[PDB]
Amino acid sequence: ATGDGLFIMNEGNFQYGNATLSYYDPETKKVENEIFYRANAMKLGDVAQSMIVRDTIGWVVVNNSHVIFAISTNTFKEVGRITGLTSPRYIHFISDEKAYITQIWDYRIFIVNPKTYQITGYIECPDMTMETGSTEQMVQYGKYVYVNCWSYQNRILKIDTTTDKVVDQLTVGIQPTSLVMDKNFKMWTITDGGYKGSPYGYEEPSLYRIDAETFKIEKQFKFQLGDAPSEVQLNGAGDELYWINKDIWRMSVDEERVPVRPFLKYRDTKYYGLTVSPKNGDVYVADAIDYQQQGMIYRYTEDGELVDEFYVGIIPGAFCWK
Amino acid sequence: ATGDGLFIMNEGNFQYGNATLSYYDPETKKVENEIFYRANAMKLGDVAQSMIVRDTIGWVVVNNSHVIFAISTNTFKEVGRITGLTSPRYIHFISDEKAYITQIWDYRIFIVNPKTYQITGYIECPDMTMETGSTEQMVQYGKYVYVNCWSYQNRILKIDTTTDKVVDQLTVGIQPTSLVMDKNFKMWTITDGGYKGSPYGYEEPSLYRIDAETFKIEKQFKFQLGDAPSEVQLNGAGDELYWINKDIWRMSVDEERVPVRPFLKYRDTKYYGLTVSPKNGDVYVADAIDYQQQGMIYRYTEDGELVDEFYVGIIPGAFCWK
Ligand code: NA
Numbered sequence: 212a213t214g215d216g217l218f219i220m221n222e223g224n225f226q227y228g229n230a231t232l233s234y235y236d237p238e239t240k241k242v243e244n245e246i247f248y249r250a251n252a253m254k255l256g257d258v259a260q261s262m263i264v265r266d267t268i269g270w271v272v273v274n275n276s277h278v279i280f281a282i283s284t285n286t287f288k289e290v291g292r293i294t295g296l297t298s299p300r301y302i303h304f305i306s307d308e309k310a311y312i313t314q315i316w317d318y319r320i321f322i323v324n325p326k327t328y329q330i331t332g333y334i335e336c337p338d339m340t341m342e343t344g345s346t347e348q349m350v351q352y353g354k355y356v357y358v359n360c361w362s363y364q365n366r367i368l369k370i371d372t373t374t375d376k377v378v379d380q381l382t383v384g385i386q387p388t389s390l391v392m393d394k395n396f397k398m399w400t401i402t403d404g405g406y407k408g409s410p411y412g413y414e415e416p417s418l419y420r421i422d423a424e425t426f427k428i429e430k431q432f433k434f435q436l437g438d439a440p441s442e443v444q445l446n447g448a449g450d451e452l453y454w455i456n457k458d459i460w461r462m463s464v465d466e467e468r469v470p471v472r473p474f475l476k477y478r479d480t481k482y483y484g485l486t487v488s489p490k491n492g493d494v495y496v497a498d499a500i501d502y503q504q505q506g507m508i509y510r511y512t513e514d515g516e517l518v519d520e521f522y523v524g525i526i527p528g529a530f531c532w533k
Numbered sequence: 534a535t536g537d538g539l540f541i542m543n544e545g546n547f548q549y550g551n552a553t554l555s556y557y558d559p560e561t562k563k564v565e566n567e568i569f570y571r572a573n574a575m576k577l578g579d580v581a582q583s584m585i586v587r588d589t590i591g592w593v594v595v596n597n598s599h600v601i602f603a604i605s606t607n608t609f610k611e612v613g614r615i616t617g618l619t620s621p622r623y624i625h626f627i628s629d630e631k632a633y634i635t636q637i638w639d640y641r642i643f644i645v646n647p648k649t650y651q652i653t654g655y656i657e658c659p660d661m662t663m664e665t666g667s668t669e670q671m672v673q674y675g676k677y678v679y680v681n682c683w684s685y686q687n688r689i690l691k692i693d694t695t696t697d698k699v700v701d702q703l704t705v706g707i708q709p710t711s712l713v714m715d716k717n718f719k720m721w722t723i724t725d726g727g728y729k730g731s732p733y734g735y736e737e738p739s740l741y742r743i744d745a746e747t748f749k750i751e752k753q754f755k756f757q758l759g760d761a762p763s764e765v766q767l768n769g770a771g772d773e774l775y776w777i778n779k780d781i782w783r784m785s786v787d788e789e790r791v792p793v794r795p796f797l798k799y800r801d802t803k804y805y806g807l808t809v810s811p812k813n814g815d816v817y818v819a820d821a822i823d824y825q826q827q828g829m830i831y832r833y834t835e836d837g838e839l840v841d842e843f844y845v846g847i848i849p850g851a852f853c854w855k
């Protein structure tokens with residue numbers, strides 16, 4: 212919320228158990244690596260995946276360790292953990308006593324009580340199996356949570372939080388990757404188009420603007436076959452949209468045309484991850500390099516001036532702001 | 534948010550300039566009176582009316598001093614103030630840089646930037662004048678702010694926060710007093726019925742349950758002619774509704790009939806304000822007594838057991854949790 216500190220989730224290598232958590236302070240430009248291991252004398256696990264901060268507690272999703280850790284955002288000390296998660300993706304709080312945890316390889320969204328760390332129920336997604344089930348990012352509008360369904364799916368689902376039931380769905384292009392809501396209460400999702408030879412599909416990917424109140428598609432911007440966009444996101448004001456599509460792209464949330472010029476042109480760095488400071492609009496991009504050594508983060512001002520570079524953990528893939 | 538500290542706004546006597554601010558610590562059962570004056574060497578003013586707390590800053594609305602003071606919730610020292618307000622009632626933040634302040638004797642809701650303390654615009658309410666205009670409490674559902682219109686009015690208005698315009702209205706009984714939203718995203722408002730000899734009107738007052746998503750009245754509970762109810766309030770979970778109508782009344786938000794038995798019996802005084810601890814469900818009742826002598830606060834458990842009683846300022850009518 213403040214933008215005064217940045218957490219970086221380093222995925223590590225799948226099944227090698229070498230995920231780590233980094234913390235960067237934009238004011239001092241100092242990075243700290245392996246902070247969870249150093250504070251807890253315990254490895255973070257396998258494939259760190261996402262994180263949210265809520266009232267000085269950070270909730271770190273470790274996808275292939277089937278766990279979310281609650282940690283102090285000051286000391287990085289574990290205060291609790293939720294285990295038993297099929298393959299968790301994101302956590303979104305409904306209240307202090309209720310949160311939803313999305314999953315891959317499950318047709319259910321898990322409901323937890325964050326005060327007890329216990330799973331209290333499940334939301335069954337329609338027309339989904341354990342074999343190809345996928346739920347991902349969540350946004351909330353009024354009483355409803357919207358969630359994109361990514362791997363081998365092509366839908367946004369609408370959940371009534373007063374009943375914990377899916378009440379509607381919206382079909383989009385195959386594999387919407389991410390989901391955010393702007394200052395006009397329009398949701399944005401960008402699909403990745405599958406891939407050549409996919410058992411599911413391969414098509415031109417698209418960026419959609421969807422009214423949150425009415426769940427209606429308002430705009431669809433189509434890209435080229437072969438593009439695999441990802442990580443649509445917003446600045447702090449919710450009025451500038453960013454995403455990855457080889458380059459880093461941005462546009463005003465009121466634009467009716469996608470710009471021809473990107474924010475950061477792709478040349479010598481493959482952009483593995485992206486975030487925007489909610490405080491000053493700085494843009495951060497992750498470089499996974501060779502997927503074996505420390506990856507690095509580049510920090511740009513909103514005007515494109517490179518102001519910092521810092522090495523983190525292995526395959527930095529997600530960000531979370533204090 | 535925590536429920537560890539309670540502010541009490543003592544209205545003082547109208548036009549006497551003797552409003553004060555009190556702070557109560559439920560753990561020690563210690564009250565501190567005249568805290569604003571003690572911390573700032575400045576009288577609070579005339580008709581302190583309401584307060585909200587946002588990120589350790591308290592925003593104290595002083596209706597007949599035309600000002601909202603931003604104070605530290607630790608030291609109670611002023612950090613800034615918003616002046617130039619016709620006769621402010623409540624403040625509701627839309628974002629860090631945008632808040633709405635309702636008014637009596639104005640047809641406009643003021644828009645402010647709380648970071649600069651400046652008035653940045655106005656929301657014109659339809660079919661309202663400076664002479665009898667009234668906007669009062671606010672709740673937000675999605676992109677919309679709903680507001681009750683109290684003195685010489687009989688409406689709830691719906692404001693689109695993305696345009697800062699009134700986009701809809703709902704007629705209710707005359708003079709809806711207060712507005713809350715429960716855990717089912719139903720709004721509740723209770724009218725006072727005017728009074729016999731009012732220049733505006735007089736009728737049986739009612740409690741309404743209104744769907745926030747569709748702005749539709751779902752339930753209307755009518756009371757006896759001559760009652761003048763006020764101050765709907767919710768517990769922390771948003772599942773028990775309380776209000777004043779001589780006695781203190783409560784019911785589950787899922788109840789289909791108003792109860793015949795009250796929570797706290799009338800005692801020949803003037804219950805004037807009400808709050809529920811969001812931490813433990815204790816119920817606090819502000820008693821203005823006779824509107825002249827020093828008021829008292831009664832603290833009860835959610836089960837009706839008296840826990841404490843303490844003296845505050847003159848006409849204690851509003852509460853805010855730290
Ligand atoms: Na709505």
Ligand code: NA
Pocket residue numbers: 476477478479480481482
């Ligand atoms: Na590049």
Ligand code: NA
Pocket residue numbers: 704705706739753
């Ligand atoms: Na009516």
Ligand code: NA
Pocket residue numbers: 559810813815
């Ligand atoms: Na209490």
Ligand SMILES: [O-]
Pocket residue numbers: none
């Ligand atoms: O009154």
